[PDB]
Structure 1
Amino acid sequence: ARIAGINIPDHKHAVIALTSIYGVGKTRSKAILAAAGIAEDVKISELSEGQIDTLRDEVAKFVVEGDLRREISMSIKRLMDLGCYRGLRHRRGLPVRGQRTKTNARTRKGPRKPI
């Protein structure tokens, strides 16, 4: 119930639980379970410690949690200090993939700031 250094829920099925690892979604969770030979509908608190060890080994293959976080952070910071268009967009906290900013863009710009 502690894979890649984080607590994962014991009450949920294995596929749903493994998605709690920052870096594993449904697809990677299914791949991990298949490679470790564990049913997709089994609940975490009902796996043998050997099975959890194998799961640890599998999830160790992929970059997750802190390593992934700092990888993403160094990619963003490289964009930043290069100061290309995407670096400038990231600095200003505006949409980065060519969306419209005349309206919407609330996810990047934050909620309404009245004048």
Structure 2
Amino acid sequence: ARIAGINIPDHKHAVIALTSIYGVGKTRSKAILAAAGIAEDVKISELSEGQIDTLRDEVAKFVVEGDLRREISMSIKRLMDLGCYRGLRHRRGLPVRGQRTKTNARTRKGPRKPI
């Protein structure tokens, strides 16, 4: 119950439990169990250590966790120092994908700030 440096739940199906890894969604979690030869509905509790290791190498094929967290942070970093319009939206906390800001946009702005 220790993959990619983190601990994954033991009472959950293998397909659901693997999604606890930053960088592995339901699709990738479905591919890994396929690449290892394990069913999806099997709890990782009753998984032999001879099987967990066969999952760890497959997870190594993907850029997950801190390496992904550094790639995403670098991508944003590249826009912000560039001065491009997208990086200016990241600077000012506004939405970047051309959404309306007259109303809404509270996910990027946060809760309301009275005058």
Three-state SS of the structure 1 residue aligned to 2:20 is: coil
Distance (Å, rounded) in 2 between the aligned partners of 1:20 and 1:73: 20
Long gaps (5+) in structure 1 = none
Three-state SS of the structure 2 residue aligned to 1:31 is: helix
Query: What's the % identity of the aligned pairs?
Result: 100
Distance (Å, rounded) in 1 between the aligned partners of 2:79 and 2:50: 43
TM-score (normalised: structure 2): 0.99
TM-score (normalised: structure 1): 0.99
Distance (Å, rounded) in 1 between the aligned partners of 2:94 and 2:44: 41
Deviation of residue 34 (structure 1)? 0.2
Deviation of residue 102 (structure 1)? 0.5
Q: Residue by residue, what CA displacement relative to the aligned partner does 1:34-56 show, whole Å, maximum 9, x if unpaired?
A: 00000000001111101100000
What do you get for the CA RMSD once the two structures are aligned?
Answer: 0.5
Q: Residue by residue, what CA displacement relative to the aligned partner does 1:7-55 show, whole Å, maximum 9, x if unpaired?
A: 1100100111000000000000000000000000000111110110000
Distance (Å, rounded) in 1 between the aligned partners of 2:84 and 2:113: 27
Q: Which runs of at least 4 in structure 1 moved beyond 4 Å after TM superposition?
A: none
Distance (Å, rounded) in 1 between the aligned partners of 2:46 and 2:96: 44
Distance (Å, rounded) in 2 between the aligned partners of 1:94 and 1:2: 38
After superposition, where does 1:35-74 map in structure 2 within 5 Å? 35-74=35-74
Partner of 2:76: 76
Three-state SS of the structure 2 residue aligned to 1:19 is: helix
User: How many pairs does the alignment contain?
Assistant: 115
